Amino acid sequence: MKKTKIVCTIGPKTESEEMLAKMLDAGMNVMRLNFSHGDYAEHGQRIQNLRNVMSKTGKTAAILLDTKGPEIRMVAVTYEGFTTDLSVGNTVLVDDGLIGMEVTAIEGNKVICKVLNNGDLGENKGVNLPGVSIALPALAEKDKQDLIFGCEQGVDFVAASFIRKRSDVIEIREHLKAHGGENIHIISKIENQEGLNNFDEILEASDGIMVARGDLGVEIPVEEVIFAQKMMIEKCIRARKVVITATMMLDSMIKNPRPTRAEAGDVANAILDGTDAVMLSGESAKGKYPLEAVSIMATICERTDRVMNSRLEKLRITEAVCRGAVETAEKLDAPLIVVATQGGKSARAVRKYFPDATILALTTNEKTAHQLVLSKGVVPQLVKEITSTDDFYRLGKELALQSGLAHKGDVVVMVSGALVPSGTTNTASVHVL
Amino acid sequence: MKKTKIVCTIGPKTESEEMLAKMLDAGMNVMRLNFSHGDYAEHGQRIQNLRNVMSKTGKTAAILLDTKGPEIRTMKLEGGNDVSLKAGQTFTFTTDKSVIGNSEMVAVTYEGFTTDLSVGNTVLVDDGLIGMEVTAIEGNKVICKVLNNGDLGENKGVNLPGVSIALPALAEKDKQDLIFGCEQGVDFVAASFIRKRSDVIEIREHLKAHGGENIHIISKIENQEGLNNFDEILEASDGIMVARGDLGVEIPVEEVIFAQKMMIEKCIRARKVVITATMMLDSMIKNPRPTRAEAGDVANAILDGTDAVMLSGESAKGKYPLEAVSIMATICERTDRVMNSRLEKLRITEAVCRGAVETAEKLDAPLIVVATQGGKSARAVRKYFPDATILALTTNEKTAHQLVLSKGVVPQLVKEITSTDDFYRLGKELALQSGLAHKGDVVVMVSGALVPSGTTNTASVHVL
Amino acid sequence: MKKTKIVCTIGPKTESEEMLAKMLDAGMNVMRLNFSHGDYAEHGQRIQNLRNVMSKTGKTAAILLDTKGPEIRTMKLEGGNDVSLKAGQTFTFTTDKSVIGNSEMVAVTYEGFTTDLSVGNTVLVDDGLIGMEVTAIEGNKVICKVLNNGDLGENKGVNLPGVSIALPALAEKDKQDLIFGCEQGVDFVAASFIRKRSDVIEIREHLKAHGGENIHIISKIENQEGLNNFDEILEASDGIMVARGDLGVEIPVEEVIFAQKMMIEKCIRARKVVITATMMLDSMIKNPRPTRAEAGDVANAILDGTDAVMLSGESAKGKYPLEAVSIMATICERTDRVMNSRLEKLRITEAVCRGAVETAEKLDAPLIVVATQGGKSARAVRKYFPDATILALTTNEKTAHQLVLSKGVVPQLVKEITSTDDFYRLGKELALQSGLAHKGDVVVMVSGALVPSGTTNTASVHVL
Amino acid sequence: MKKTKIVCTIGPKTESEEMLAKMLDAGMNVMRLNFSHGDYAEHGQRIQNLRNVMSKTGKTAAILLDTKGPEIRTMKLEGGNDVSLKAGQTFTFTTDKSVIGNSEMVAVTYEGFTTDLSVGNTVLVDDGLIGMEVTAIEGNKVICKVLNNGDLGENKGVNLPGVSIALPALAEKDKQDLIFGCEQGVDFVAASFIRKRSDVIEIREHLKAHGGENIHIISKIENQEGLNNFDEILEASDGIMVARGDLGVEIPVEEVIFAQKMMIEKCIRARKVVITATMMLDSMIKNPRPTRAEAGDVANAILDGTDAVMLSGESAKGKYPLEAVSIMATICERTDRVMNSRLEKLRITEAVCRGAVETAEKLDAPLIVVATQGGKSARAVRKYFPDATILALTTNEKTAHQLVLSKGVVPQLVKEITSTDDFYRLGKELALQSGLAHKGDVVVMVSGALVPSGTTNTASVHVL
């Protein structure tokens, strides 16, 4: 059964309970909500329906909120500081890369440029200032209400748009914490050369990364974009942080109930690079065939996961422990690695080595039972309490057999923290069911 | 410099010497002649031109003749107008080549469309535009049921999943194209729609009848039968062309990457070339820049491990053909750059050619000089993805051109090589001459010695 | 500090408390009681002196009772006068125990001497002093030709190299000695002349009979038959004593090293103690420094991988016992200090314990703390030759004592460990208080959880 | 069968063509002439005797000159009677070679005794028989306190544990020995008591002045100074002899094995021969079979990786010199048999030669044919302990001689090789001819090509 997770952007064609239950069945794991449209009571109801389908069925799913972030769209440009922040020689581009201009003069409220290439300029096009740094907040007074709605509803993840550096992340995170959303994970969307160059620092600040290669492409040389993707997936796998692969996934399916062979290859290679999750935007949100897309997407995942291997080859404790747990599991042919988590780090720590076995992750934490839904190959499980290391062993032996994920006489490797604080994974323990 | 080779389909937009020189200058290595169109006088000239440029410049290049192969076409419609088909509708295929079609029925060029197809099977028209499962067969008719909405034009292609189409390996015309190619002396022949071992042997027997015994046969796997017979098809051929677009029509979508990755992997093991072909930078037929999706697709096939990536319409008829070769070259360069050598029943040649590459690497040699007759040893070194350029010395002119298709090899025609010490002596003179290395560079040299041409058996480390 | 354990034979010149305490200081770990000698009253006070030194000092040692064994000896000569035998002469052994021998004939204590032997067989008398070849077995006579000049004394040992001897597993006195062994509650019994599995089973039965079921049987391999059946013998035993001198008078000399190395290796694999025993520092029976060659042979046996090295008469009855222990122990520390862990069907215990050592090494842990009931999981950890010391906590005393014989384990006896977390709390307390580790140090802790005695399943890492 | 080589000391009881011939049959590879004994006529005849046997049989051997070397000895006693020294007594050595001593004073041969020694230093006399500690040095007297009881005889050896002695590199008769050594064209010279690089540089200059520039210098490491300077000594030597007995009287016991194994390790890595030399089978001087412990000591020295193992008194002045060679050789065959290649700063020869052994093993080659001018490539391929035999081809007869000492090489003097292919051609003729390999065997062939003497840069695989 598939291991990599499917994020499905849900809008009004798909928000019903009956569809949401269908889409969970087809392999949806996370509802993405893209607040570049809609009204709050609509969205608020879109959440409740999923949360109803969840009670009604026993399925887990996570909720992820998208923020739009900063934009810049003789023509008239939205951004008043355009003239300040641009510089002589700079390369402006309009309409996702279509026309490139080089800045010759800026006088007053005017950036006068020389057009470098032919193109048909229209209404409301994108302006990209590659290199150039923009003084717009990561999170402007306008998208901030989106966030607050998000904390209020208690979404699991926030994907933040147009992240260019550490500071940006920290400013999304200081917002959330101002409103009770401190336990909400931030996924940073690298959509530009600046964010790209600042990735390692964007990565230490965030909880994950959304690889938006479409957006990124506009800004950097084509022959660099896959390599950006691969690097960022690899850097995320190492850090133990979720990474979604997001843009241009199965786009044809907004018009067709079957994907291009080049889309499928492109989704399969991202999974092979090592993602946690693959994303469906309009295919599930606006298009004519949303349940078709989730289902083909799920067969691509399943077919791809199932040929992939484990990945075992200062040195840290959690790293030694969790690498041994997976090495030992596969050695002993265990179907499962059963893990105790508070905030998820150690289910994430095990997953980093791409286990054959399923991670069944026991938490008493609700947010982290949901959040873990976005981690590759992980099945979260909310438990009432784990009182001791032997209790954990005893409980997880019950839930493993009970899970149907293993049977009597199966070997199961159990991973947890014992006499340590939350941050750490420190003991591994093999058991026969 | 780029190690993977670029095969460019030359058309009349590119066939000139001044444009062919530019293409060799942007990074084209192999000229593909698509005999699904054109004529012998034209292709004859396209050949002479390249041979002229290669003479004019001193560049090397290979010439690949692509066969059109067996097809099933639907034929003509009433008044030559497209008809609109619709789901659940009965449609019917007729074997009568003079029945003109409408939205109820067409005729198909293939006389055994019934004799072969079977009640229940899938029929797809215009490269999978329209799908249809069979519900009956009677007489000269395949009575079908239409599964989705489309418009049927005239003369469309028919893809018959599963159906062992008993069409022959060589078309009526295909034989005369092959004969043209033997006469012209082309280096490779890429043969379309290879379903089994016997299909290969039928092209090889054809070429052998005509002085083509030394021509390499690149089999195009374009359907499920060919896939299922890959290992045997590969034992029989000299290389493989992965046709992704074609296979995409023929097999489930989630299988194609894996059909590609699987075929490239086995080609490398077999020491035979592999071209990754359809659906590369097709957008560049209208656009002077590629998709991010396209440049990505290309990079992943180089990373999978191809020898060569192929330009079709983008260099044959597209509006921006020199741009394709250049961005296709920068993608190559960029990708090879970050690739590693892969070193981790005995075979003497595997043994020495793996050592010689592992040593090159440890000693930081710029070059591996290899001595070949038919290219095997240079192909056997290439199998471990050396960092080092393989400079391969031949006295055989054909295998000198043929070798231009292999990854990161640079062929060089030499007068004779008289002995093992002479090889070492001559290859150092040419290694310095090549500008691929310099004084005090180490150079591993690979060759056979007191052995027949099959075998590569000795290696030698030299400081220039 | 040294990791390989020293077994010291205790006799009357070193049996005192003051001396026992010095030797414990020098490196003694195990007191061997050789029952070739002494009475039960002596060995009893011997055992008592050591127990009082352990009381008074908190040192732990073990007590290993070494049987004398069944034997074939020659018996009494005319007048008690040694005789000189000549190369080539005839000589006869007689099963007849009444015959007072001379220059032509002796009696041997073994009734089955004619049965066991064969024409062509070699008989060695007095530690291979004299050899002879069997020329005819007639009646109660074995008639031989003398292979070399030598002097026969009374009551000499006989070795039948290559021959199976149907002597019993235990001499009569041996059975009477073993019950004393049970009474006294010794930790080990080393059983002499072990030839086959059945011998070991017998011995186990005997001890089991007298409440001695927790006493470990160390099988002494002293000849070819025993070497032949070593695997099935090691299976039935708790460990092995490699008696090199005996093997050297029984099997070809060039074989004895590989006998030693094979048996230490299979003991390590089976997770069972091995003692390297005879001919260690015998020169120190007379001198206060060992030979160069003596020092090398001990060192090589530790590098082979023994748990323990043995002193015999040079700590029991020699003139420099305390110097023997000391230099023995300096060879020990010197050799241990340069050995490496050994990390490279699959079981749970082996998987866990090898992860324990491997992780310990990676994380620079001074200590691996194990909780044992019967000693196994300390021995399972010891198999990989860790750099860390193994603190092994038991509530079981006999095992706390037997674990003293195991390479580089520091046993220690505890009230109780109630749970797995209790274990990790307890072992950190004792790890710090042991002075083996200090605050900041990592400590890998190994145990069994929700499993019965047999099994080591879990492992935790902690910083002190 | 065996690969490790045997140096045998030839003395009176063994010097005859009949004897030497059986010696060679039994395992002898090198004749050691020990120049602590015997006039030049004697050694001259032994030299001739051996060269006769070789000629008359086609056998190869080498001849090695073992210098006596510089010494400190005690001198003459009153009336020439042994004096018994008592522990705690005062005892003085005098630099006055006029004095005739007794139980309180002796003269020594060494004038620098007083200089080199220090209060607190240990003096040993008669191979460690009596030890003493310096209490004061006054004038030409080193006043001591005797450490243990013993009879000092006359003309006894003195060892100064850990003291740098400024005796010269060479004794006066040593120089005259080395000149005879040159006239005789011996193949090696094992120089005695080598303690710093400058000593070797001297011995080399002496041989060079007498036309012995082709003679290899084996440095004997006999004390702590030699050991601390072993890296630069090894570097200026062609090889090493480990004098264990002497190291035993000079450095801490527990340290001697390690000194051995270190020095064997470093000679392997350096591609220079190493001989393990003293106290191997000394018991066999009086006895026809060796000791268990002696057998073990030889086997371990072989597993450490020696080229050669040395006999002394056993073959020179023993009772059973041919018994000794035989069991030594059985010990060799038996141990060599169970050892493995060692495959697992970036240089050419090391790469080619590792690859060759590496390739030979993969392909199971019985044989590696090497072409050598001064033996280096034989010694380079030997470094990895190939399973295969090295058949080493030279036109140089000295190296064909010296290569006799290298582990598992079979020297072959050939009339020429004119090219690399000429090599490959001849190496198969000889490989088949040699009975070592047979039709169908793989044979790996290693040489230099387009390179001067120093370098091994080409390897080739051939089927016979």
From Swiss-Prot, chains B, C, D:
Catalyzed reactions: pyruvate + ATP = phosphoenolpyruvate + ADP + H(+)
Record keywords: Acetylation, ATP-binding, Glycolysis, Kinase, Magnesium, Metal-binding, Nucleotide-binding, Potassium, Pyruvate, Transferase
Keyword ATP-binding in annotation: yes
Pathway given in the UniProt record: Carbohydrate degradation; glycolysis; pyruvate from D-glyceraldehyde 3-phosphate: step 5/5
Recorded name of the encoding gene: pykF
Cofactor: Mg(2+); K(+)
Record-level Gene Ontology MF annotations: ATP binding; kinase activity; magnesium ion binding; potassium ion binding; pyruvate kinase activity
Protein name: Pyruvate kinase I
Residue numbers carrying N6-acetyllysine: 76, 319
Coiled-coil segments on the chain, per record: none
Binding site for Mg(2+): 222, 246
Ligand binding (ATP): 34-37, 73, 156
EC number: 2.7.1.40
Residue numbers binding K(+): 34, 36, 66-67
Subunit details: Homotetramer.
